[PDB]
Amino acid sequence: LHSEIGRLNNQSLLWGPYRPNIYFGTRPRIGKSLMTGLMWGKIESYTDFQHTVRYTCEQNEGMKGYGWDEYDPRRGGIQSIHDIQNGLDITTSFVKIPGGAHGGSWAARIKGTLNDDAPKDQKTIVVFYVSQEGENSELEAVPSENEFGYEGDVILKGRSEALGNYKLVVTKGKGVIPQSDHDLSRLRGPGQTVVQSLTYPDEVLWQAKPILFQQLKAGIDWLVENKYDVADPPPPWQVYLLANKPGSGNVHIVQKVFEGDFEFDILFSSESAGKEVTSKDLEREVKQATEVFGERFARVFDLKAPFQGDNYKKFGKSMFSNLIGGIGYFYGHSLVDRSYAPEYDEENEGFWEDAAEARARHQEALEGPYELFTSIPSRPFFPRGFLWDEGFHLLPIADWDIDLALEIIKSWYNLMDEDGWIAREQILGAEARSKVPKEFQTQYPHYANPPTLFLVLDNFVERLRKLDETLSTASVDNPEVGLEYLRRLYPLLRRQFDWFRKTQAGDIKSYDREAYSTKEAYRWRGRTVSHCLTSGLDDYPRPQPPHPGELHVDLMSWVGVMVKSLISIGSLLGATEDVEFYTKVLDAIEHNLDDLHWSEKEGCYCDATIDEFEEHKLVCHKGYISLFPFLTGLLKPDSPKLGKLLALIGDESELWSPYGLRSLSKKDEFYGTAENYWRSPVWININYLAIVQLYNIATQDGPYKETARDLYTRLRKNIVETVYRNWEETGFAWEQYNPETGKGQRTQHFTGWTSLVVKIMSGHH
Numbered sequence: 001l002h003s004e005i006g007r008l009n010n011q012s013l014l015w016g017p018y019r020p021n022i023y024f025g026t027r028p029r030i031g032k033s034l035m036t037g038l039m040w041g042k043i044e045s046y047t048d049f050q051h052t053v054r055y056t057c058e059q060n061e062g063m064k065g066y067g068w069d070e071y072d073p074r075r076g077g078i079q080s081i082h083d084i085q086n087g088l089d090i091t092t093s094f095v096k097i098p099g100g101a102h103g104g105s106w107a108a109r110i111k112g113t114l115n116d117d118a119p120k121d122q123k124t125i126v127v128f129y130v131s132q133e134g135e136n137s138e139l140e141a142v143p144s145e146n147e148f149g150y151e152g153d154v155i156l157k158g159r160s161e162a163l164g165n166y167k168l169v170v171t172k173g174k175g176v177i178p179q180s181d182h183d184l185s186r187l188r189g190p191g192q193t194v195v196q197s198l199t200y201p202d203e204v205l206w207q208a209k210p211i212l213f214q215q216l217k218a219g220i221d222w223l224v225e226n227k228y229d230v231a232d233p234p235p236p237w238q239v240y241l242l243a244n245k246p247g248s249g250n251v252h253i254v255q256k257v258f259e260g261d262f263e264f265d266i267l268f269s270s271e272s273a274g275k276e277v278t279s280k281d282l283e284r285e286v287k288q289a290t291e292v293f294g295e296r297f298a299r300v301f302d303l304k305a306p307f308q309g310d311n312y313k314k315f316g317k318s319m320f321s322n323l324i325g326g327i328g329y330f331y332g333h334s335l336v337d338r339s340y341a342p343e344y345d346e347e348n349e350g351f352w353e354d355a356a357e358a359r360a361r362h363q364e365a366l367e368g369p370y371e372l373f374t375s376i377p378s379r380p381f382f383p384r385g386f387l388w389d390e391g392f393h394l395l396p397i398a399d400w401d402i403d404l405a406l407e408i409i410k411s412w413y414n415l416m417d418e419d420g421w422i423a424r425e426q427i428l429g430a431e432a433r434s435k436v437p438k439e440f441q442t443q444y445p446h447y448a449n450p451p452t453l454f455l456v457l458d459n460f461v462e463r464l465r466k467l468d469e470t471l472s473t474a475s476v477d478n479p480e481v482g483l484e485y486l487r488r489l490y491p492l493l494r495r496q497f498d499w500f501r502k503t504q505a506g507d508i509k510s511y512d513r514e515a516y517s518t519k520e521a522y523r524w525r526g527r528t529v530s531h532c533l534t535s536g537l538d539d540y541p542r543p544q545p546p547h548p549g550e551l552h553v554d555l556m557s558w559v560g561v562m563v564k565s566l567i568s569i570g571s572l573l574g575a576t577e578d579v580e581f582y583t584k585v586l587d588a589i590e591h592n593l594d595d596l597h598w599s600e601k602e603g604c605y606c607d608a609t610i611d612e613f614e615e616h617k618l619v620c621h622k623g624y625i626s627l628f629p630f631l632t633g634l635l636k637p638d639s640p641k642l643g644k645l646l647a648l649i650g651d652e653s654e655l656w657s658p659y660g661l662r663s664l665s666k667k668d669e670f671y672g673t674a675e676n677y678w679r680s681p682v683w684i685n686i687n688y689l690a691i692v693q694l695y696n697i698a699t700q701d702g703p704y705k706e707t708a709r710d711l712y713t714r715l716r717k718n719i720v721e722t723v724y725r726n727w728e729e730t731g732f733a734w735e736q737y738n739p740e741t742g743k744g745q746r747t748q749h750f751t752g753w754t755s756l757v758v759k760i761m762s763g764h765h
């Protein structure tokens with residue numbers, strides 16, 4: 001039955017618009033298969049279309065905004081795109097229709113409406129690009145009746161082992177098709193839909209833009225060769241209309257030119273299902289998905305006072321839909337330095353220079369292929385998996401669809417190597433690499449990242465203890481299903497725990513360090529003079545200089561998170577021997593957090609280092625790091641330490657801004673210095689952990705219940721309202737928020753853990 005649910009989840013989730021790196025395209029969760037993508041741009045001249053055409057996601061002055069209005073990966077959704085440069089408001093509706101043996105069928109409607117600014121007779125070129133990878137598969141465009149191109153729909157027939165037989169139709173669509181009266185029309189037609197069918201080696205089919213341009217350039221070369229010149233040139237849009245040549249190939253370019261508003265459909269029909277998908281079917285299933293989305297949202301994300309109003313509901317739906325709509329399927333090789341150079345142990349003073357030297361050996365090489373099914377932080381700026389971000393992404397997604405979240409967890413843990421390492425940034429294949437400078441592609445097996453995916457796991461466990469609808473909760477509704485999933489994952493969780501303790505160990509015994517346990521101590525590998533990227537808090541101030549005797553209180557707290565999860569899950573699995581070990585490790589971390597990291601003078605936790613005189617020294621920088629044992633849920637509700645931490649949290653002169661908790665204290669000497677990434681701004685992920693922990697204290701008997709209740713109420717409101725006001729005013733989720741002005745800054749489209757606001761509004765943790 002676990003096996004049954006697994007197959008039903010696979011069939012359910014196989015198709016989607018799982019290419020979040022582009023405005024609109026589709027692919028199945030299969031490495032080498034059929035992929036589609038949309039391009040469009042206005043053409044007003046002989047040289048502008050190369051500058052207007054849209055394909056990969058960006059965000060700049062020429063794009064007002066874009067994102068998912070509603071989305072559910074089992075069903076589909078609606079995206080809206082507001083393009084200033086191209087004078088167009090675009091809607092892309094995508095819907096799935098279950099049936100057959102190959103993961104079902106799907107449809108999309110592409111609709112473009114000129115805005116008030118655009119010339120009414122604007123010419124817009126639209127391309128639907130279709131590629132298929134694999135050795136034993138076929139795809140063919142059925143030729144036109146007409147001489148020069150298509151009057152009606154374009155039908156592609158194809159076949160593969162993974163998809164069986166299928167057909168993909170691009171419908172005639174609606175809108176004016178310009179007509180040229182030029183001489184050229186005698187040879188290229190007056191203006192009509194055209195199809196070019198081509199082949200390239202499979203590994204370059206993702207390069208849709210260059211492939212299209214090479215075809216456009218050959219058309220223009222033909223014009224030049226055939227005496228079409230500047231004394232009497234065809235119109236631009238006709239110069240850029242490809243010569244029709246359908247056929248067999250692994251690339252099919254379908255092009256239309258429209259004057260004024262337009263729409264057309266894409267109908268994918270899996271032969272192994274019922275009759276073929278129609279436009280009427282598209283429209284009916286779009287209506288139905290929206291109805292279902294609405295009902296699930298109101299149930300799963302019932303927003304509490306004072307956020308029950310329709311404005312906050314719209315906001316919550318946008319924030320949530322952009323998060324879950326960012327899910328992608330990635331496939332390909334990764335760049336990894338597998339030298340395990342000894343410089344990477346970082347055992348000496350000045351280790352950063354030796355690690356640099358080792359990196360300058362450039363021993364990294366491609367490996368894989370790997371696949372990953374994950375939500376992402378940023379469509380325009382970094383559309384790929386990031387390890388600790390995903391833990392936050394899945395917190396709302398798990399509310400919506402626990403089976404979906406488990407599927408993504410499983411995907412990530414399937415990357416883990418024999419040692420217990422998962423690379424913190426997952427850049428899979430040439431297409432993903434195209435968004436990343438080569439200097440930042442290489443992954444390092446000694447680089448960790450926070451194990452936030454355990455938080456999602458903790459939520460799953462608590463729900464386990466206490467057809468699309470069915471599937472979405474199948475792993476909690478059937479406890480034997482959920483337990484088996486845990487049974488299979490548990491070893492990898494355990495491997496990861498051991499990997500942390502083996503590779504991220506700090507040094508107690510080699511110095512004059514007294515502590516309850518001689519084992520429990522941790523130091524993030526990979527730090528440079530000004531950064532600790534592996535911690536996730538890139539430039540939060542750390543001991544200077546970096547030092548092999550450093551100890552990091554956030555890392556120890558994360559190990560605490562892991563061991564508590566392992567206790568819960570071990571207990572579930574009857575892993576008695578494992579659990580007693582975990583228990584002693586927890587006890588030891590609890591004491592060592594105090595003995596190595598607590599500052600009585602400063603009234604908070606601090607990272608530690610080793611002096612010029614070889615002595616343990618605390619290095620206090622009041623900010624997120626200082627609160628870590630509290631944030632990660634390690635402290636008793638009566639802890640006097642917790643009480644002081646609550647005082648720091650609520651202190652306007654330190655962390656408390658009207659807009660959320662500042663990452664660093666205004667009193668800290670590094671407040672707002674250098675790049676000021678984690679040295680003042682308000683970050684939603686850490687504010688979220690604070691909110692959840694304050695609520696926990698607020699809803700139990702204890703000495704700090706009322707303090708926590710007040711702080712909870714206000715921080716919740718502060719954080720929600722800052723994200724909401726910014727979204728209202730800009731249309732975007734931002735990476736972080738300015739604590740003096742409240743304004744969103746750094747990158748836009750960060751959905752991304754900023755989307756946690758939907759769960760903060762939902763409340764009742």
Ligand SMILES: OC[C@@H]1[C@@H](O)[C@H](O)[C@@H](O)CN1CCc1ccc(CCNc2cc(Cl)cc(-c3ncon3)c2)cc1
Pocket residue numbers: 377380381382386388389435536537538746747
């Ligand atoms: O979310 C993942 C991680 C966190 O896990 C970590 O905790 C958190 O601290 C960091 N954060 C983001 C990491 C990240 C930061 C920046 C970049 C882009 C680098 N250069 C660039 C590239 C492009 Cl394509 C556009 C632009 C751009 N920006 C404004 O205008 N143009 C800039 C990539 C990844």
